[PDB]
Amino acid sequence: GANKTVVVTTILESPYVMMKKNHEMLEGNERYEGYCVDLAAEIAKHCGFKYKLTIVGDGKYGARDADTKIWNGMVGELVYGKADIAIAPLTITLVREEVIDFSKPFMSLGISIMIKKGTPIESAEDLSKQTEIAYGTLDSGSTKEFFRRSKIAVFDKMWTYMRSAEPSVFVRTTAEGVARVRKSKGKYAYLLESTMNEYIEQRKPCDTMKVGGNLDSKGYGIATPKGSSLGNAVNLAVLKLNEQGLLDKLKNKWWYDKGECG
């Protein structure tokens, strides 16, 4: 049939997608800015479709409830046919790959440790061997799931620690984890994806830092419903954008050109 506007599901997560200050004076896609807004425009240009950015109803990335078997977040929007594509910092995982399609990575990343500057921690092993400095993750998402599923000895011990720590070491949002780091006088470390750690490191008041190597290696992908006809074009678009250096340009723009820490 006739072409339709492609419904893009995304999430408000700086610097990937933010509402512009002057959003009330703008309409539609122009209300938003960020790395994923720019990426969505580049993909659309290359694939020759028109699209509407929509924010995921429940503010979640995507996980399957263990009892009800229902997928939430952006994954759920794709699975249940509420959106045609997800363009977001959405991690390619095994469990998600089984239910939706993903492009090859548009960004490479790993779980990493955020500390308040001066915190005497250099590695995950360091965290795992102590409890003076509390540490946690988002209360949902691929980072939490990594620890929950991990059989690697250090990570398995960290998960048992995080699951049992009081008060709770889990945070509802990246902003909440960052503010907890900044407010805890070195007694909370935050486990989050390296690209987000890197972004925060260039934000005022420049009091956090990424420490140690990454715990794992993975990527974000553009996601579509399994079998979607859009999947192919979009994947080739990501590959072309990467090869042309445009993804590297988008990262520099949102991380470093706009950096507040010198």
Residues of each annotated binding site: 89, 91, 96, 142-143, 193
Q: Are 74 and 3 in contact (CB under 8 A)?
A: no
Report angle CA 55, 61, 67 to the nearest 5 degrees. Answer: 120
> What's the CA gap between 152 and 137, in Å, rounded?
17
Provide the annotated binding site for L-glutamate: 89, 91, 96, 142-143, 193
Binds its own copies by CB under 8 A, chosen from 24, 27, 67, 98:
98
Site string for ligand IBC, 173-212 (x = CB under 6 A): -x-----------------xx--x----------------
CB of residue 216 vs ligand IBC: minimum separation in angstroms? 11
Largest Cα separation within the chain, whole Å, is 62
Does the protein bind ligand IBC through residue 13 (CB under 6 A)?
A: yes
The one segment of 31-39, 79-87, 88-96, 123-131 that binds ligand IBC by CB under 6 A = 88-96
- Residue 121 or 196: the one with the smaller Cβ distance to ligand IBC is 196
Closest by Cα among 102, 3, 98, 110 to 48:
3
Does the protein bind ligand IBC through residue 90 (CB under 6 A)?
A: yes
The one segment of 162-170, 171-179, 196-204, 218-226 that binds its own copies by CB under 8 A = 218-226
234 phi and psi angles, rounded to 5 deg? -65, -40
> What's the CA gap between 103 and 46, in Å, rounded?
15
151 phi and psi angles, rounded to 5 deg? -105, 0
Residues that bind ligand IBC (CB under 6 A): 13, 61, 89-91, 138, 141-143, 174, 192-193, 196
